[PDB]
Write a protein that holds these residues in place. Sequence first.
Motif, PDB file in Angstrom:
ATOM      1  N   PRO A 123      54.363  89.550   1.327  1.00  0.00           N
ATOM      2  CA  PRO A 123      55.109  90.877   1.607  1.00  0.00           C
ATOM      3  C   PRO A 123      56.326  90.752   2.939  1.00  0.00           C
ATOM      4  CG  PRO A 123      53.001  90.249   1.946  1.00  0.00           C
ATOM      5  CD  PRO A 123      52.697  89.096   1.693  1.00  0.00           C
ATOM      6  N   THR A 124      56.659  89.214   2.765  1.00  0.00           N
ATOM      7  CA  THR A 124      58.058  89.576   3.792  1.00  0.00           C
ATOM      8  C   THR A 124      59.287  89.035   2.821  1.00  0.00           C
ATOM      9  OG1 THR A 124      56.955  89.405   6.059  1.00  0.00           O
ATOM     10  CG2 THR A 124      58.851  89.202   5.880  1.00  0.00           C
ATOM     11  N   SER A 125      59.244  87.142   2.560  1.00  0.00           N
ATOM     12  CA  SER A 125      59.860  86.690   1.720  1.00  0.00           C
ATOM     13  C   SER A 125      59.370  86.789   0.100  1.00  0.00           C
ATOM     14  CB  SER A 125      60.219  85.471   2.237  1.00  0.00           C
ATOM     15  OG  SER A 125      58.787  85.028   2.350  1.00  0.00           O
ATOM     16  N   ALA A 126      60.675  86.696  -0.745  1.00  0.00           N
ATOM     17  CA  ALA A 126      60.035  86.331  -2.344  1.00  0.00           C
ATOM     18  C   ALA A 126      59.824  84.821  -2.633  1.00  0.00           C
ATOM     19  CB  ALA A 126      61.513  86.046  -3.244  1.00  0.00           C
ATOM     20  N   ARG A 127      58.310  84.771  -3.011  1.00  0.00           N
ATOM     21  CA  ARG A 127      57.566  83.509  -3.070  1.00  0.00           C
ATOM     22  C   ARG A 127      56.724  84.081  -3.545  1.00  0.00           C
ATOM     23  NH1 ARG A 127      58.216  79.195  -0.289  1.00  0.00           N
ATOM     24  NH2 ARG A 127      58.806  80.577   2.137  1.00  0.00           N
ATOM     25  N   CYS A 134      59.406  75.017  -8.481  1.00  0.00           N
ATOM     26  CA  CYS A 134      58.195  74.998  -7.143  1.00  0.00           C
ATOM     27  C   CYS A 134      58.573  74.559  -6.228  1.00  0.00           C
ATOM     28  CB  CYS A 134      56.762  74.146  -7.794  1.00  0.00           C
ATOM     29  SG  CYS A 134      57.887  72.556  -7.611  1.00  0.00           S
ATOM     30  N   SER A 135      58.148  76.107  -4.826  1.00  0.00           N
ATOM     31  CA  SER A 135      58.857  75.509  -3.459  1.00  0.00           C
ATOM     32  C   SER A 135      58.295  74.404  -2.801  1.00  0.00           C
ATOM     33  CB  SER A 135      58.634  76.422  -2.763  1.00  0.00           C
ATOM     34  OG  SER A 135      58.798  76.658  -1.906  1.00  0.00           O
ATOM     35  N   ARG A 136      56.742  74.716  -2.569  1.00  0.00           N
ATOM     36  CA  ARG A 136      55.412  73.710  -2.026  1.00  0.00           C
ATOM     37  C   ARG A 136      54.270  73.559  -3.117  1.00  0.00           C
ATOM     38  NH1 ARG A 136      57.120  71.548   1.945  1.00  0.00           N
ATOM     39  NH2 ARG A 136      55.094  71.369   2.220  1.00  0.00           N
ATOM     40  N   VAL A 137      53.562  72.781  -2.857  1.00  0.00           N
ATOM     41  CA  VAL A 137      52.556  72.003  -3.745  1.00  0.00           C
ATOM     42  C   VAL A 137      51.349  71.483  -2.061  1.00  0.00           C
ATOM     43  CG1 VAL A 137      51.324  70.498  -4.945  1.00  0.00           C
ATOM     44  CG2 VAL A 137      53.577  70.868  -5.771  1.00  0.00           C
ATOM     45  N   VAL A 138      50.389  72.267  -2.444  1.00  0.00           N
ATOM     46  CA  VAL A 138      49.219  72.133  -1.773  1.00  0.00           C
ATOM     47  C   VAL A 138      47.991  71.906  -1.926  1.00  0.00           C
ATOM     48  CG1 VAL A 138      48.063  73.323  -0.095  1.00  0.00           C
ATOM     49  CG2 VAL A 138      50.584  74.006   0.287  1.00  0.00           C
ATOM     50  N   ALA A 148      42.749  78.558   4.669  1.00  0.00           N
ATOM     51  CA  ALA A 148      44.171  79.774   5.370  1.00  0.00           C
ATOM     52  C   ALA A 148      45.163  78.177   5.673  1.00  0.00           C
ATOM     53  CB  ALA A 148      43.946  80.495   6.541  1.00  0.00           C
ATOM     54  N   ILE A 149      46.024  78.024   4.713  1.00  0.00           N
ATOM     55  CA  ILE A 149      47.198  76.880   4.730  1.00  0.00           C
ATOM     56  C   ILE A 149      48.335  77.808   5.371  1.00  0.00           C
ATOM     57  CG2 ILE A 149      48.432  76.248   3.338  1.00  0.00           C
ATOM     58  CD1 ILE A 149      46.416  76.922   1.473  1.00  0.00           C
ATOM     59  N   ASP A 150      49.163  77.688   5.880  1.00  0.00           N
ATOM     60  CA  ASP A 150      50.379  77.624   6.766  1.00  0.00           C
ATOM     61  C   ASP A 150      51.532  77.653   5.958  1.00  0.00           C
ATOM     62  N   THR A 151      52.507  78.555   5.880  1.00  0.00           N
ATOM     63  CA  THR A 151      53.694  78.857   4.730  1.00  0.00           C
ATOM     64  C   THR A 151      54.450  78.002   5.012  1.00  0.00           C
ATOM     65  OG1 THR A 151      54.306  80.999   4.675  1.00  0.00           O
ATOM     66  CG2 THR A 151      52.390  80.557   3.873  1.00  0.00           C
ATOM     67  N   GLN A 152      55.289  78.099   6.186  1.00  0.00           N
ATOM     68  CA  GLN A 152      56.468  77.518   6.333  1.00  0.00           C
ATOM     69  C   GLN A 152      56.751  75.940   6.717  1.00  0.00           C
ATOM     70  OE1 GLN A 152      56.016  79.029  10.778  1.00  0.00           O
ATOM     71  NE2 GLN A 152      57.093  80.330  10.290  1.00  0.00           N
ATOM     72  N   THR A 153      54.397  75.334   6.477  1.00  0.00           N
ATOM     73  CA  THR A 153      55.133  74.225   6.712  1.00  0.00           C
ATOM     74  C   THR A 153      53.027  73.484   5.412  1.00  0.00           C
ATOM     75  OG1 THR A 153      55.275  73.386   8.425  1.00  0.00           O
ATOM     76  CG2 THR A 153      54.594  71.760   7.244  1.00  0.00           C
ATOM     77  N   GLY A 154      53.109  73.173   4.802  1.00  0.00           N
ATOM     78  CA  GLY A 154      51.610  72.370   3.643  1.00  0.00           C
ATOM     79  C   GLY A 154      50.558  72.275   4.421  1.00  0.00           C
TER      80      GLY A 154
END
Lengths: 99, 108, 543, 359, 113, 125, 125, 51
Positions: free
Chosen positions: C321-325, C363-367, C404-410
């Motif tokens: 809801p804050t960034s385009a992702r 793909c920005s991040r893979v978790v 619950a996963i952080d989005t700044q870091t994987g």
Amino acid sequence: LTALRHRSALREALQGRDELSVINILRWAGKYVADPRYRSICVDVAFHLIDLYAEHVGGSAELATQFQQLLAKVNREVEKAELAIVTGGMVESLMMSVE
Amino acid sequence: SWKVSKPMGGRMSDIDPIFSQDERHLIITYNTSIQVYSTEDSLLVRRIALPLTPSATHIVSSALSKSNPDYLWVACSDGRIWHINWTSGEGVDTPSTIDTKKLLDMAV
Amino acid sequence: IISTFDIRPIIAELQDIDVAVGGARGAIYVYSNLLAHLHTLRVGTIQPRKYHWHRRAVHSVKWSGDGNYLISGGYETVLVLWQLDTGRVDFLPHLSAAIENIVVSPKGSAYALHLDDNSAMVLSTAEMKPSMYVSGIQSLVLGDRPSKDALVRRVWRPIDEIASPLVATISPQNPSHMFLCVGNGQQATVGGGATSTPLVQVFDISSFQGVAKQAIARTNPTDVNITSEGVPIIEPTATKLAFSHDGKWLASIDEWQPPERDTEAYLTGSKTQSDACKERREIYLKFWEVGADQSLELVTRINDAHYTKQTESIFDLASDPTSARFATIGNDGMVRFWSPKLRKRDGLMATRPDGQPLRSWSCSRVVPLPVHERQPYSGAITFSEDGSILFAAFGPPSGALVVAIDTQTGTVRDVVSGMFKGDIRAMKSLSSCLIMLSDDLVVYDIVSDEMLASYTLKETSEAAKKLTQLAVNHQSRSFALAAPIPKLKRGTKSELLIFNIEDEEPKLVKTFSQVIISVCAVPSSSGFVVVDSAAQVWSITEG
Amino acid sequence: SWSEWQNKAMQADELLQNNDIQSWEELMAEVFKPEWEWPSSRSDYARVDRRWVVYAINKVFGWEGQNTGRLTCRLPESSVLIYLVDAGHLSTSNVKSAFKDDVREVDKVEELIGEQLPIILAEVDPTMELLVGYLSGTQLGSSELVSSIKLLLCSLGLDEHRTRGLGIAFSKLAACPAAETVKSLRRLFKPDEVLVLLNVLRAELIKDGWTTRYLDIQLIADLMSRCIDAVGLSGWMANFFSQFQAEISVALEGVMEAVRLKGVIAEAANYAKRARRALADSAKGKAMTVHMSAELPLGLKTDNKISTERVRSGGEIVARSSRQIGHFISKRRGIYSIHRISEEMLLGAAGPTVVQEAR
Amino acid sequence: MDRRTAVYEPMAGQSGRWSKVFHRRYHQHDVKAMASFEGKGMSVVVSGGSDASPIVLPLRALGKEFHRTLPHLPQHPTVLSAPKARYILSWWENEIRIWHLLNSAQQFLPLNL
Amino acid sequence: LGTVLNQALRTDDSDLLESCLQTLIIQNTINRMDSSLAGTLLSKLAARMHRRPGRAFGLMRWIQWTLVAHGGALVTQPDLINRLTELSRVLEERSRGLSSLLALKGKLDMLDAQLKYRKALKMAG
Amino acid sequence: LGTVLNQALRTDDSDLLESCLQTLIIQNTINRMDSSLAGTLLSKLAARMHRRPGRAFGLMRWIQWTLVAHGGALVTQPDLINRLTELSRVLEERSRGLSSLLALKGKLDMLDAQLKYRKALKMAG
Amino acid sequence: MAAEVVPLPQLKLPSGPSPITAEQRYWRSFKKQKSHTSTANWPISHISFPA
RNA sequence: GGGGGGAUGUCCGGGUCGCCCUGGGCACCUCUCCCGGCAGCCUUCGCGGGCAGCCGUAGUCCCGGUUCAUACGUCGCCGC
């Protein structure tokens, strides 16, 4: 071919062929089963062809080679598909020691 | 604390959507609504709501009064018949029961 | 078998009548002179002229004014015109959907079509363009009159049924517009057996008029609606569609599998037709730009989003809801974050011919997710309302667990388990709590790590179990779910429960005369909108 | 329910300070629904509230505040503890909910609990049936799994419970994903213990028999992968790996010609089954095209029964007419055929005797 | 030539105006010729096509009674046999074809036929 | 070895079957075999198949050529489908590891080949 | 062919790379190669990998021995992970058909082998 | 609203991670080649054009 | 497909030895109900319910061994 599989009619396209025409479709399937961009459509038309024209492989011999030559590439496609995942784990190795 | 608005929109029923005299308004009968559109601009100029209430009751048929225009005979599944007039809303609150087991069709 | 019929008078005396009975075998019989054949014990022989063009049941047949033309319309989406003086036909072939009803104006000039996809058009004759157009909400409808072509035991008998919740979003930066998934027609959608909804229409909420329509998956309104066998063709369905935070980006997913009666020839050993279909599942993930004319444009299309040895299904996606992702969780086990970048191969940026630079999502991040298998899983995700943290419920039967996963870091910041009695249905996140619904419903705070609200729902059928869903407001801290009161049929009753976040007392309970199909939250203000299967829309609000 | 449970918890704290663990065990018995008699089904355990669970966990386990605490057994001998292990509530999420207060500044909490808990259980019970119960009941992380495999290996390297638990841990760690398993395995293991583990897995393979000659899986491949590249080059940097890859190549050759003959035997089985139906029907006298000789027909095809339903236009179905059935049967008939009629046929009882030219 | 036979009736009202009541594929190849007849209580039309089989159709009761495909094989049996020598024999345009059978069938009560 | 195989099959021997099968002549045997004996043969090889899964290199060839020559014998001999499907799931147990063992071969082969590289450097060092 | 490969890699040749690679000496080349050149090498082979997927028999061997010898070069050269993962999904496109093509080989091989059986019967008939 | 007839749209297939870019097709689109030898095979020292 | 029977043909211990039978192997016809599909008639607005049901296999007087397919508007050439 992708549109003719999306509409349920690939069997309808194949089921009325003649000998030289079916040799031609086998020849195209054999030539282009190698590329992984359309191996799915190629193996689908291959399945339907083996199902729909397996009875006259003894009645004519020139068709019989093309079924066998479809094997030869299939027998060689699985090996490259086998080695590709061998390297597929080999490249997985370095991507875990990097961390 | 919360409140629920009245039903709007709806499904366009399978009765023939009728024309008016002089071809200017099209009277379309939805389920639980009957609304009249101005044709040249495609805009509803009236929306006469119709209360339905008995689970599955539907508007069975509808037509213009062939004696006098600007009157609609509308008939629902249970036997209720409305004699409403488009360009107004005179008649929604006053249906008329026909005392029937189940109504299947009507024709004026 | 009589589907429809239109009579015309040969005239202020009534000399004769001439009837056209459109019969559900696909025929159009014309009885010429009925009163002169039946005025006279004994009668002379009568013989109806047969006009056969449609394949399914004709839905409407009408004579046109002066009686030269016998116009008709059926399920093949084509308004046919039988010339009836010569032997010719001439026809308007490509409408949107099945021709449900027709009429002629008092003057012979205007035709009027009621189209099956909730529409009507007034056409001028020999102009053949819609001089007037009206379109509605186009959802799934349980029609009271069942069908005009369900009478003659077709291959797939079309059923008045609801299978899946409506895929519908209220778009920010224009809250009066609502994007929602519709097939070509209602009958053509539910036909074939599976839901087939490859269209998105935008619908105005202030004034309930269907604004516009566009295609997501591949769709051929120019092709034949039926195969040669008689089966209605099924199109890729848009399963999941969620909206960006900017109001300008859109992510969709379509899924498609060939029919089990189609495959028939890939089965080798223990492989069933359902197995062959689930193996030959095709799925695309498409990123679209939204232009301010409500115009959808593709920018990206991934063919294999969650890929393993075969293709794996995608369970859910949600926007930060804050960034385009866009985060997507699927059948593989990993959660993938997609972000937009600019196309720049080697410092040479590629632009639109107008000059603007092309963007593309990747793909920005893979978790990878933790799995805890005790001795057919599902998925769901939701961002926080503040970003930076994403809740991901992974969903094997009874044992199912949230992460619950952080989005700044994987890195994983949290994992909770033991919070599901059955298979997960969905999950949303309020200001601090996660509202998850499975066979039970749990509101659970994460700042105190404690189950605030627990609810056991009454045991019901599998259709109702798939048919329950919730939606949260995020502006006034209030969620609301939707459940039908207990196989699905026409006359059912449903009730929704607007709760507050803090207490256990539902602040509003209201049973509905028809079963509700969609619940959505307007983002600009408080409250919700709800779409009901007798496809009517109304709003709930506080104050 | 909050106030009632808070008063019940206050009663439990009063009983804790009064130190009557017998009556405390009985109140927890009436909560969980002393003798403490068990049900003989791990699934058949009654539902219980999370607040009671986390309060019991706080009662039994402990913490050490020095920037890194340590769970300790304040009650190492307790049916409450063995119930917790048997009902599987001993998760990292549960112990976090039990220890919300003391922990919030400690880092790597999942790693710390997954490395500390099995050591605690292993010192509670030397017979580790409680540990196999833990592996069989509780949702486990990869850290907990590799830790329990470590404890089993130190125990071994009356003699089947440990192997049962070890196989259960193997399946669970195969289910666990690659990244976290590699990370915690490299963290908690040493390369020599890893080589011992690879010898265990080699024993599993060669005892399952993938090399020992014929006429004279998933989980093991996954676990060997995760361990091998959890150690990596910084551990090994021989003929050991030469013979190991020799056996691996033998196994892969076996499985590849296995999938070959799997396809072959599947298609021949399905043809023999259609043949069973077709031979029964040709014996009845439905007169289809049946093969007779000992070699295969080229197209593995039979003639099924002609269906009683037809397809009309556009999509409707109608029952077939006997006239058309006879038309198709006369079509299916071949060029030359001997069709002997009998006196039972002329009476109307039995059927004919048919032999057609094998086309 | 679409192997298609259509039946045409006058329209009611205006005079001399005809319209197609109904059409159907009776033959199997193109319908080459037809001739009608109406007498002694029998109203028929016979159409010969290219499939050698004349189809008759009722005229005044058309659509009320089924048609009929007459046999395209000749009325004379045109097959004869010498049973002592086991010879069967047939004939057409200028050739006479003779088959021998060489065996009974009690012996055969697959690959020998 | 046709009569040899034929005896062992119809007498339910073990050691004679070993003597003739544990070693061209394979095709000649299956050419001269008889029919229900081939059915029992496939049954016995399925037993060997599950019992010790070490050397496939002979018995898969035997099953191959049997399905070639007397495959259509089993077709008109069709009450014994269970002898085929008792093997047909046995071989679907035999495919399991090919879902993941191939990925183990790749990750392990480099450890071989890196030794091979330090061993191909070793003669020159 | 060490300096040859080295030139073609650092000069972004095509035909010289073809001349040295389209054909022991493979191991000698990768032993004498240098580091960032091996990174660009893997990049170029990924291009050839997707572009024409006909003969894997040389290039998979080349990528194999490269990952053997200068694999740990890429480890301390670690900003160029994209050159590995641009291949690493390219090869997961290369595994697709192994989910079902193997089942086609079985169903098709008998049609070959049944011809083979009627062809091994044919000299004796 | 008669929707217009549309031919079959071709497939935008996925490209590998080395596409022939726009500048590559440009510098290969410098198409027509003429090879003019010099006199006595002198090595060409310089070429130029005004601005 | 299952459960059972009534009756068809068969070898192995067989039985005073015959009608057959028990123990094993069995393939067919007949009845029986539950399985999957279709239809009709009543009650209900529907959801559902009730009633006597047919089909799950074979060859006809002739013969449904049919009937059925998606428009116009404008063409051509060259370029990016």
